[PDB]
Design a protein around this ligand. Sequence first.
Ligand SMILES: *[C@@H]1O[C@H](CO)[C@@H](O[C@@H]2O[C@H](CO)[C@@H](O[C@@H]3O[C@H](CO)[C@@H](O)[C@H](O)[C@@H]3O)[C@H](O)[C@H]2NC(C)=O)[C@H](O)[C@H]1NC(C)=O
Ligand SMILES: *[C@@H]1O[C@H](CO)[C@@H](O[C@@H]2O[C@H](CO)[C@@H](O)[C@H](O)[C@H]2NC(C)=O)[C@H](O)[C@H]1NC(C)=O
Ligand SMILES: *[C@@H]1O[C@H](CO)[C@@H](O[C@@H]2O[C@H](CO)[C@@H](O)[C@H](O)[C@H]2NC(C)=O)[C@H](O)[C@H]1NC(C)=O
Ligand SMILES: *[C@@H]1O[C@H](CO)[C@@H](O[C@@H]2O[C@H](CO)[C@@H](O)[C@H](O)[C@H]2NC(C)=O)[C@H](O)[C@H]1NC(C)=O
Ligand SMILES: *[C@@H]1O[C@H](CO)[C@@H](O[C@@H]2O[C@H](CO)[C@@H](O)[C@H](O)[C@H]2NC(C)=O)[C@H](O)[C@H]1NC(C)=O
Ligand SMILES: *[C@@H]1O[C@H](CO)[C@@H](O[C@@H]2O[C@H](CO)[C@@H](O)[C@H](O)[C@H]2NC(C)=O)[C@H](O)[C@H]1NC(C)=O
Ligand SMILES: *[C@@H]1O[C@H](CO)[C@@H](O[C@@H]2O[C@H](CO)[C@@H](O)[C@H](O)[C@H]2NC(C)=O)[C@H](O)[C@H]1NC(C)=O
Ligand SMILES: *[C@@H]1O[C@H](CO)[C@@H](O[C@@H]2O[C@H](CO)[C@@H](O)[C@H](O)[C@H]2NC(C)=O)[C@H](O)[C@H]1NC(C)=O
Ligand SMILES: *[C@@H]1O[C@H](CO)[C@@H](O[C@@H]2O[C@H](CO)[C@@H](O)[C@H](O)[C@H]2NC(C)=O)[C@H](O)[C@H]1NC(C)=O
Ligand SMILES: *[C@@H]1O[C@H](CO)[C@@H](O[C@@H]2O[C@H](CO)[C@@H](O)[C@H](O)[C@H]2NC(C)=O)[C@H](O)[C@H]1NC(C)=O
Ligand SMILES: *[C@@H]1O[C@H](CO)[C@@H](O[C@@H]2O[C@H](CO)[C@@H](O)[C@H](O)[C@H]2NC(C)=O)[C@H](O)[C@H]1NC(C)=O
Ligand SMILES: *[C@@H]1O[C@H](CO)[C@@H](O)[C@H](O)[C@H]1NC(C)=O
Ligand SMILES: *[C@@H]1O[C@H](CO)[C@@H](O)[C@H](O)[C@H]1NC(C)=O
Ligand SMILES: *[C@@H]1O[C@H](CO)[C@@H](O)[C@H](O)[C@H]1NC(C)=O
Ligand SMILES: *[C@@H]1O[C@H](CO)[C@@H](O)[C@H](O)[C@H]1NC(C)=O
Lengths: 162, 276, 198, 50, 81, 149, 55
Amino acid sequence: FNGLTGTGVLTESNKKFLPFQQFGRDIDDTTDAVRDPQTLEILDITPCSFGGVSVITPGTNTSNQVAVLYQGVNCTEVNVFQTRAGCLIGAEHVNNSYECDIPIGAGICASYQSIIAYTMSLGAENSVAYSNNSIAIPINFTISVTTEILPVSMTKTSVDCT
Amino acid sequence: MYICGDSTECSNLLLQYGSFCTQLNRALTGIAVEQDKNTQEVFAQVKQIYKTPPIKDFGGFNFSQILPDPSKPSKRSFIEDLLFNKVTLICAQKFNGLTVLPPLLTDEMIAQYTSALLAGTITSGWTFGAGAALQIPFAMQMAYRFNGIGVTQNVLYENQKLIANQFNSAIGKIQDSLSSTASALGKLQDVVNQNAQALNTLVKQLSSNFGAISSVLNDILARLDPPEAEVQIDRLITGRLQSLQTYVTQQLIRAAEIRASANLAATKMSECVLGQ
Amino acid sequence: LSSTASALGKLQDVVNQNAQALNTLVKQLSSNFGAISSVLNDILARLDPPEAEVQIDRLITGRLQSLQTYVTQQLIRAAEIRASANLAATKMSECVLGQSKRVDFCGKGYHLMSFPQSAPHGVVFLHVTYVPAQEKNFTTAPAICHDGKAHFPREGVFVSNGTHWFVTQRNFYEPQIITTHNTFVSGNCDVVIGIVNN
Amino acid sequence: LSSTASALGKLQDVVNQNAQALNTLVKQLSSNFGAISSVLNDILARLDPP
Amino acid sequence: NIDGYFKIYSKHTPINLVRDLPQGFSALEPLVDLPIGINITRFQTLLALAAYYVGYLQPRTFLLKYNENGTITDAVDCALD
Amino acid sequence: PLSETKCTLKSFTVEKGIYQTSNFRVQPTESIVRFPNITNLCPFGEVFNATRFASVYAWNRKRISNCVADYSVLYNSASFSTFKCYGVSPTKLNDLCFTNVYADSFVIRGDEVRQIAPGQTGKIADYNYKLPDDFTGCVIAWNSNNLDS
Amino acid sequence: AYTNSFTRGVYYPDKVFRSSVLHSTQDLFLPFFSNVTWFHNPVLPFNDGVYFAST
Ligand SMILES: *[C@@H]1O[C@H](CO)[C@@H](O[C@@H]2O[C@H](CO)[C@@H](O[C@@H]3O[C@H](CO)[C@@H](O)[C@H](O)[C@@H]3O)[C@H](O)[C@H]2NC(C)=O)[C@H](O)[C@H]1NC(C)=O
Ligand SMILES: *[C@@H]1O[C@H](CO)[C@@H](O[C@@H]2O[C@H](CO)[C@@H](O)[C@H](O)[C@H]2NC(C)=O)[C@H](O)[C@H]1NC(C)=O
Ligand SMILES: *[C@@H]1O[C@H](CO)[C@@H](O[C@@H]2O[C@H](CO)[C@@H](O)[C@H](O)[C@H]2NC(C)=O)[C@H](O)[C@H]1NC(C)=O
Ligand SMILES: *[C@@H]1O[C@H](CO)[C@@H](O[C@@H]2O[C@H](CO)[C@@H](O)[C@H](O)[C@H]2NC(C)=O)[C@H](O)[C@H]1NC(C)=O
Ligand SMILES: *[C@@H]1O[C@H](CO)[C@@H](O[C@@H]2O[C@H](CO)[C@@H](O)[C@H](O)[C@H]2NC(C)=O)[C@H](O)[C@H]1NC(C)=O
Ligand SMILES: *[C@@H]1O[C@H](CO)[C@@H](O[C@@H]2O[C@H](CO)[C@@H](O)[C@H](O)[C@H]2NC(C)=O)[C@H](O)[C@H]1NC(C)=O
Ligand SMILES: *[C@@H]1O[C@H](CO)[C@@H](O[C@@H]2O[C@H](CO)[C@@H](O)[C@H](O)[C@H]2NC(C)=O)[C@H](O)[C@H]1NC(C)=O
Ligand SMILES: *[C@@H]1O[C@H](CO)[C@@H](O[C@@H]2O[C@H](CO)[C@@H](O)[C@H](O)[C@H]2NC(C)=O)[C@H](O)[C@H]1NC(C)=O
Ligand SMILES: *[C@@H]1O[C@H](CO)[C@@H](O[C@@H]2O[C@H](CO)[C@@H](O)[C@H](O)[C@H]2NC(C)=O)[C@H](O)[C@H]1NC(C)=O
Ligand SMILES: *[C@@H]1O[C@H](CO)[C@@H](O[C@@H]2O[C@H](CO)[C@@H](O)[C@H](O)[C@H]2NC(C)=O)[C@H](O)[C@H]1NC(C)=O
Ligand SMILES: *[C@@H]1O[C@H](CO)[C@@H](O[C@@H]2O[C@H](CO)[C@@H](O)[C@H](O)[C@H]2NC(C)=O)[C@H](O)[C@H]1NC(C)=O
Ligand SMILES: *[C@@H]1O[C@H](CO)[C@@H](O)[C@H](O)[C@H]1NC(C)=O
Ligand SMILES: *[C@@H]1O[C@H](CO)[C@@H](O)[C@H](O)[C@H]1NC(C)=O
Ligand SMILES: *[C@@H]1O[C@H](CO)[C@@H](O)[C@H](O)[C@H]1NC(C)=O
Ligand SMILES: *[C@@H]1O[C@H](CO)[C@@H](O)[C@H](O)[C@H]1NC(C)=O
């Protein structure tokens, strides 16, 4: 448009231009709305979809298939399953809740038992039998041994300049 | 996407600077991954998910102000709602390259974790941190807690009503402080302000000449011949690289202190709530 | 420990991070950075000073930037390792040379004692803990008033097996008959809520 | 305290580190950095803008 | 009159005061741009078949605020106080 | 995608987890171009066909606007001696759309034609006609030995 | 006579549409809270521009 080169999708805009402007800018330098030089209407501009790709795999040593997650893209234009962190292709949706090993996001995560995506479960749910006239006391005991690992230092390296 | 906006030749020139891009992506990914472990290690300290019984015979103490409210979209309590109101959706990646990722644990799961912790603390004392929860009446748990600081236990059993009324009044007095002095939550706003300012500076430093003839790549690529446009394409990569490096360094430095604060919060939860 | 692997992930991660950083630094030595060649020997043996100095300046500034980046990353990592070492020293001083009373510090349960062992670049702690089990739940009471005098337990708790009352310690079930050598009297049984005759 | 030296090591080390950093920052103004001269007024006074 | 360009802005609103310039804010929307390229130092007003104010502009930094519809609502003069 | 993962990790075995490989974008097609209706020819030729030129100290200044500029017909002409063009480009002048054009026409001797360039001093470039430190279109010089000689 | 020009002399600097933003610009403006000289045909100076009101 008159030397203004751009890429994106054009839509009929709603914002009102005073009779002496030519184009608008959302913030800083973001040319979003433009008035054409011939037919004298206003069209707004927005870039078309783009974004990263992630691969969910159970491991080559176990299986040989993967699933693909498109980040922040409403994939109606690319078993498709629409999540809040993009959308997942290659996985099936189930109702059951387990504890998962491959977190995806927004409370949704997937695993392989092929390649099912579900909602993680916090843990086993139980209710304590509270009363104002009864207590519980142990009768037996066990001795347990636990391990923990803590690093204290790393290697010493000296690099010259010349 | 940030340095060479949707261009082809600019990427071919950027390939000559070695690999000053795997490091930045790796560092940002590491920070993003660590941000999830920070939240995981604090709240996720209870194995099961307990819940309070419908019986509300706690000896006189009134916990209705902190227990979850079923008639709520998020099943939160009164104080959590007050806190949420006092702090001010498929988000796509902008043409700058900016991207915001959603947290792994949504707010509902955090609310469930806190509710489970509170129910266990009320109905089992400190016995649910070692092994299985062992029920004990609340009055006797509070008497045991007095016995732990020197005061004998017959002080509570003859002053139960006074202590209950004082606790109820003290709990009630906190709603006014939270809903009237909005400046109390100053520790949770400085982080957001600093992050916003840093990212705003990063975005705003895109429209700078840096010694070139234009601040936008398309203008240079549509006017200068390719033999002599290579000089003006440079002096533009070498400013954006420095901007990105500075942003990454400050992000790492300010994430270190967040990690330290998360560790302190985890310690406080471990030995202040579970025990005495 | 002998069978299950991946129990030493932290040390392996530290070593891998160091190796990756050093390998990237060495690998960054083969970039043109805008010059004509990636080796100074060819540039010096193929040109005259007037523009050889320009090429050398380009290479020098690129390599200096890379080295500064590496040094800064190393400083950050060293600070993190120092924090971890301070935590390890505190745990060694508190849980090995004494007995710890703070919860969620050493082990999951009631701490008893600990043993240190070495590691390639760290330390391994073996904590011994006491965990109760085989629970059983009884009927209780806060105080017992006899002849109008309320008796409270010195250390323990009143329980009933169904017909009789005993005083037991909290963490283990050892019933004892109620005498005046393990209970103390304070007041009268008119203000306490839960008084049981006995 | 009044006889043995090198007792307050940490505070002296901190002060020395700060002083050394400031001194090495100030000492950088004399570097040529590949220009003709390290002084700016003179190099402005002996050359044309280009 | 800048770099060979004569630019004329204007506005027209009624007021209720009868003494002097009223209290309020109102932006000026441009009318005329001319590529003349001339030197101007003095000016004079012509009559019809009497009362006007004259002020002089100076370089300055302003902070303008826009509303939802794209009209200036207020401004801040940086070098005032 | 598994091959992409192996390339990114630079190994033949990948462990359980989620990995980021690359990014995708939608490729645009069917380019569109919009231009105004003004299509009147422009008097550029007259600028080069002025029968009389002016001295250096008083150079002819002309303003050009509301035209359809054509430089391809002007570039392919071989009647010019030098066409050293700073600023933008010799050939890419047909795809750019400007606001106004300034034409400065005069006559100079053969020993000062080189001095007409930004960022340099001299005799006629310092006291008669000085170009600014930024780009100003570009210059054209052609020999004439039958009118003023 | 002299009068106070309270908040007069603001114009649109550029032909660019903006909305719900705060923009910092630098241009030739009439300073806030200055004198305007009332007049009543005298020739007047033209320093860098003239804000000309009327009634
Ligand atoms: C447009 O007209 C103005 C008139 O002011 C030209 O500027 C120069 O203005 C000065 C007075 O301000 C005129 O007087 C001269 O002043 C100098 C410096 O004080 C003094 O040394 C001289 O002896 C003389 O008194 C000056 O004549 C005038 N310049 C010219 C060429 O007349 C301005 O140059 C005019 N613009 C154009 C494009 O011609
Ligand atoms: C993702 O894409 C779908 C399909 O285009 C969107 O669903 C449509 O949304 C529009 C806008 O509100 C509605 O008018 C249509 O009726 C919807 N159609 C269907 C079949 O649902 C959806 O809104 C998009 N979501 C996001 C977050 O962009
Ligand atoms: C403790 O007393 C109660 C009396 O029923 C028992 O524990 C509860 O049993 C009910 C059965 O209706 C369950 O619904 C509750 O969930 C139980 N409470 C828990 C699991 O905390 C039980 O009989 C007694 N405990 C033992 C060890 O015998
Ligand atoms: C719990 O507290 C109550 C009140 O102090 C005890 O007494 C019960 O009171 C309710 C009405 O509030 C009556 O319906 C019950 O019949 C009372 N219980 C008895 C045994 O008389 C109660 O005993 C306490 N313990 C339990 C297990 O409820
Ligand atoms: C407490 O637990 C221990 C260990 O579980 C029990 O000891 C075991 O008892 C069973 C059956 O009596 C024997 O077959 C095992 O050989 C015992 N193990 C050891 C190491 O001696 C003990 O009986 C439990 N105590 C009670 C009162 O039930
Ligand atoms: C615990 O506190 C809550 C909040 O003050 C009490 O709820 C009040 O109940 C009375 C009686 O129905 C109502 O008139 C108030 O409007 C309630 N407060 C609110 C904020 O809605 C509750 O009654 C207290 N618990 C007990 C056992 O009294
Ligand atoms: C100890 O302090 C408490 C409160 O701090 C006193 O209780 C108050 O007593 C007055 C006088 O009867 C009442 O008006 C208040 O309502 C009471 N407050 C509460 C919360 O119940 C108590 O009297 C003091 N005891 C002594 C011995 O001075
Ligand atoms: C509760 O404890 C009492 C006290 O030991 C039990 O009473 C004893 O029962 C045994 C049964 O073999 C008799 O030999 C003793 O003589 C009884 N002692 C007294 C003082 O009577 C009682 O059986 C226990 N009840 C339950 C349900 O465990
Ligand atoms: C504990 O015993 C006392 C007396 O030994 C009981 O108090 C008496 O109870 C009787 C029966 O209701 C009344 O007629 C008397 O007036 C009460 N007072 C006195 C001084 O005798 C008391 O009720 C018993 N407690 C329980 C829980 O049974
Ligand atoms: C900005 O534009 C909006 C959109 O037209 C204006 O809102 C209109 O105001 C008029 C006058 O009150 C109403 O009759 C219309 O119904 C409104 N439009 C809508 C869609 O409700 C608004 O007045 C303008 N000015 C400001 C300051 O907002
Ligand atoms: C003056 O204008 C004429 C007309 O455009 C130019 O003459 C043309 O020159 C080219 C190349 O020399 C020829 O191919 C055309 O046939 C000529 N056309 C005519 C009508 O003569 C002339 O070049 C212009 N003057 C200058 C100095 O360029
Ligand atoms: C430009 O030309 C087209 C077709 O000749 C016409 O429809 C349009 O109205 C013209 N533009 C203006 C502003 O008149
Ligand atoms: C790898 O595959 C082998 C053969 O199927 C299997 O025995 C082994 O357990 C696998 N390893 C893991 C970590 O799953
Ligand atoms: C749960 O499973 C049933 C059938 O087993 C299915 O119809 C339903 O859609 C599932 N739930 C959701 C939320 O999809
Ligand atoms: C306007 O001029 C008068 C006298 O010339 C002076 O007293 C007054 O301070 C001036 N106004 C301002 C705002 O300076």
